Design a protein around this ligand. Structure first.
Ligand SMILES: CC(C)[C@@H](NC(=O)[C@H](CS)NC(=O)CCC[C@H](N)C(=O)O)C(=O)O
Ligand SMILES: [Fe+3]
Length: 328
């Protein structure tokens, strides 16, 4: 098994006013997006130390009673409104992974998409504040911290494609974004149940099978345990870990709108018997956001692909990923 070229890109100029320097970042994003599809964003400004600390404290202290009380509908029939947000239980002996997903903190009973019961919009559920002091505040501020990083990365992608720097970010708004954070725990288990391990076609033991991301882009922090592999024509390649940088890649919505000039890379999660953390931020737009496709490889730049409304893309994509790779 070979190793993916995953360049480390200093993205801090995307926060600044040096336009030529932003173009030099944009070039690097273009190159990475045309090669393996991945890059590490470094010099990003986010306190990833605290993020890993607060997440571990939550995972290791939440009780079975709290997990039922917060469980999504797939684990608790009482919670019919929780399709996306809430706790995703492990099944000891069968399923090792467990996680907690939350959405836009601005999705409240006051929000018109909650009032209208629009699919993919939900009000976040939270544990008792006194049982998990500071957790909700941490989690909501992390959402906006990584929102700000993601908005800057979207400026880099727009420039990389020959667009004005707000081409994507103008659709990425705090009042309506469908973006999600998932706080994933992968446990150490002894013995590790074979029922929780899948075997790939090439024989590799996996915790999660191949898939394209359902996102515009994916902004991922993981603890320092190597596990990801990207598919290339030469086979699956190991993605090296970096627990200070953010692993970035395009989702299938970007592959659609660029006429596949920036492909959505296929990745999978190797089985590793180790306590670790996987904390993705899925950069989703608003429910009615439509980006007109284009083809940066054509002289006239024209694409015949349908402009796709993002909310319907997200709803169909999330169900499809569950049907293909199982309920997480
Ligand atoms: C590969 C990582 C990003 C991570 N996998 C994942 O997060 C996988 C594959 S991208 N993602 C999903 O299943 C979609 C979660 C969507 C979320 N409930 C929501 O409603 O928005 C892992 O470590 O398993
Ligand atoms: Fe993925």
């Amino acid at each position: 098994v070979s190793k993916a070229n995953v360049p480390k890109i200093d993205v801090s100029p995307l926060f600044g006013d040096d336009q030529a320097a932003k173009m030099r970042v944009a070039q690097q994003i273009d190159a990475a997006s045309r090669d393996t599809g991945f890059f590490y964003a470094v010099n990003h400004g986010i306190n990833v130390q605290r993020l890993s600390q607060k997440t571990k404290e939550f995972h290791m202290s939440i009780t079975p009673e709290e997990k039922w009380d917060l469980a999504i509908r797939a684990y608790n029939k009482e919670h019919q409104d929780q399709v996306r947000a809430g706790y995703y239980l492990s099944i000891p002996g069968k399923k090792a992974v467990e996680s907690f997903c939350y959405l836009n903190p601005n999705f409240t009973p006051d929000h018109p998409r909650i009032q209208a019961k629009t699919p993919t919009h939900e009000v976040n559920v939270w544990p008792d504040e006194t049982k998990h002091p500071g957790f909700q505040d941490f989690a909501e501020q992390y959402y906006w911290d990584v929102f700000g990083l993601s908005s800057a990365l979207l400026k880099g992608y727009a420039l990389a494609l020959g667009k004005e720097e707000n081409f994507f970010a103008r659709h990425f708004k705090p009042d309506d974004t469908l973006a999600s954070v998932v706080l994933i725990r992968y446990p150490y288990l002894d013995p590790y149940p074979e029922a929780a391990i899948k075997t790939a076609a090439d024989g590799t033991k996996l915790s999660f099978e191949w898939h394209e991301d359902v996102s515009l882009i994916t902004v991922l922090y993981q603890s320092n345990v190597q596990n990801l592999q990207v598919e290339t024509a030469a086979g699956y390649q190991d993605i090296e870990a970096d627990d200070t940088g953010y692993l970035i890649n395009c989702g299938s919505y970007m592959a659609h709108l660029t006429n596949n000039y920036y492909k959505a890379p296929i990745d999978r999660v190797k089985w590793v018997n180790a306590e670790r953390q996987s904390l993705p931020f899925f950069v989703n737009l608003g429910y009615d956001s439509v980006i007109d496709p284009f083809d940066p490889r054509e002289p006239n730049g024209k694409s015949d692909r349908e402009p796709l409304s993002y909310g319907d893309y997200l709803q169909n994509g999330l169900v499809s990923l569950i049907n293909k790779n199982g309920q997480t």
